[PDB]
């Protein structure tokens with residue numbers, strides 16, 4: 100799905116007649132939504148597809164129920180859209196978190212005290228998040244990893260049936276079986292996780308040199324807390340293993356080798372993710388990357 104500035108203003112006016120829009124510009128794109136900065140202070144998200152609308156609905160709900168529970172600012176829900184045939188949530192408007200992404204580059208050019216404070220503040224944020232009680236959240240917010248693996252396996256076997264040689268598809272089937280047979284991916288204490296926890300969602304106040312917010316809870320779910328560390332670990336694009344180690348220890352994690360193992364698994368698994376989502380949407384260049392990584 101695609102939007103003009105006019106369509107965006109029209110959707111909003113339709114449910115918020117008195118809200119007069121003075122300025123509008125595009126703040127960012129993501130995997131699910133286009134984000135619009137409206138009147139300087141609000142960020143509106145419009146969904147590009149069915150799945151993104153579904154995630155936007157869950158974002159709104161999760162953000163409302165963890166409002167004011169966390170030690171870092173997070174977006175607050177101010178405006179809400181509505182259902183549309185195939186879209187659960189037509190748009191949502193949030194408070195804008197001030198600041199700039201704490202990029203790997205930015206982090207490494209900070210002095211060591213601030214670097215270390217940052218690791219501490221991230222650890223504390225994740226410790227609080229992972230400590231929120233999950234008894235009240237519905238079934239759909241829980242992630243069944245076994246179900247995900249098994250459904251991905253079937254999607255891979257259909258999609259690649261004519262791309263891969265027999266022995267290669269055998270190796271793919273082996274890879275999945277090994278994941279399923281290894282209990283380390285399923286035997287965890289589930290909690291609320293961010294599930295997209297990376298440097299571009301970590302906003303930074305470069306005047307105080309401290310982290311001043313966390314954004315994008317679109318993927319937030321009940322799942323494995325180790326995933327919030329793994330997503331920061333990739334050498335380029337994200338932070339080093341050295342810096343996440345600092346976070347893990349502030350967090351008081353007792354099994355960093357397991358986090359490392361899980362990371363290594365997700366690193367291989369990403370190629371299949373690219374194949375599935377490369378087809379499932381429209382980018383045949385994400386499809387071709389994954390396929391090339393498998394054949395490598």
Ligand SMILES: Nc1ncnc2c1ncn2[C@@H]1O[C@H](COP(=O)(O)OP(=O)(O)O)[C@@H](O)[C@H]1O
Pocket residue numbers: 126127128129130131132133134142174193194195196197299300314315316317
């Ligand atoms: N509440 C917010 N405060 C400040 N900036 C935001 C906010 N929401 C979104 N943005 C900007 O819009 C971009 C896309 O938002 P995001 O929620 O990450 O999209 P997606 O859910 O599609 O991944 C972000 O990278 C950020 O630059």
Ligand SMILES: [Mg+2]
Pocket residue numbers: 129130315
């Ligand atoms: Mg994002």
Ligand SMILES: [Mg+2]
Pocket residue numbers: 129130131295315316317318
């Ligand atoms: Mg998202």
